[PDB]
Structure 1
Amino acid sequence: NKDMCPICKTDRYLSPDVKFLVNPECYHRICESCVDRIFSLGPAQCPYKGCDKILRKNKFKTQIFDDVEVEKEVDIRKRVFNVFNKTIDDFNGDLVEYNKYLEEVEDIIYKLDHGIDVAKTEEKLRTYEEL
Structure 2
Amino acid sequence: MDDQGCPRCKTTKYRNPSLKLMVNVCGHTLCESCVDLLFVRGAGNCPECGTPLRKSNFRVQLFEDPTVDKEVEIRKKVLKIYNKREEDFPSLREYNDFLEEVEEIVFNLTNNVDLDNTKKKMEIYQKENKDVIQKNKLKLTREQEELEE
What is the TM-score of this pair, normalised by structure 1?
Answer: 0.71
| Ranges in structure 2 where 5+ consecutive residues have no aligned partner | 128-149
In the superposition, relative to structure 1, how do residues 130 and 58 fare at CA in structure 2: closer, same or farther (>3 Å)? Answer: farther
* Alpha carbons 2:5, 2:13 under 8 Å: kept: no
* Structure-2 residue corresponding to 1:123: 119
Cα distance in 2 between the residues matched to 1:45 and 1:108:
26
Paired letter, 2:82: F
In the superposition, relative to structure 1, how do residues 80 and 14 fare at CA in structure 2: closer, same or farther (>3 Å)? Answer: closer
- Is 1:82 the counterpart of 2:90? The answer is no
Cα distance in 2 between the residues matched to 1:124 and 1:14:
43
Give the 3-state SS of the residue equivalent to 1:39 in structure 2.
Answer: helix
* Structure-1 residue corresponding to 2:108: 111
| Ranges in structure 1 where 5+ consecutive residues have no aligned partner | none
Higher share of residues assigned helix: 2
Runs of 4+ in 1 over 4 A off after TM superposition: 13-19
In the superposition, relative to structure 1, how do residues 56 and 3 fare at CA in structure 2: closer, same or farther (>3 Å)? Answer: farther
- Aligned residue-pair number: 125
- Is 1:96 the counterpart of 2:93? The answer is yes
Q: Percent of pairs identical after alignment?
A: 40
Query: Which segment drifts farther, 13-22 or 54-63?
Result: 13-22
Cα RMSD of the aligned pairs, angstroms, is 3.1
In the superposition, relative to structure 1, how do residues 34 and 15 fare at CA in structure 2: closer, same or farther (>3 Å)? Answer: farther
Give the 3-state SS of the residue equivalent to 2:81 in structure 1.
Answer: coil
Cα shift at 1:11? 2.3
In the superposition, relative to structure 1, how do residues 119 and 36 fare at CA in structure 2: closer, same or farther (>3 Å)? Answer: same
* Structure-2 residue corresponding to 1:43: 43
In the superposition, relative to structure 1, how do residues 84 and 40 fare at CA in structure 2: closer, same or farther (>3 Å)? Answer: farther
In the superposition, relative to structure 1, how do residues 127 and 79 fare at CA in structure 2: closer, same or farther (>3 Å)? Answer: same
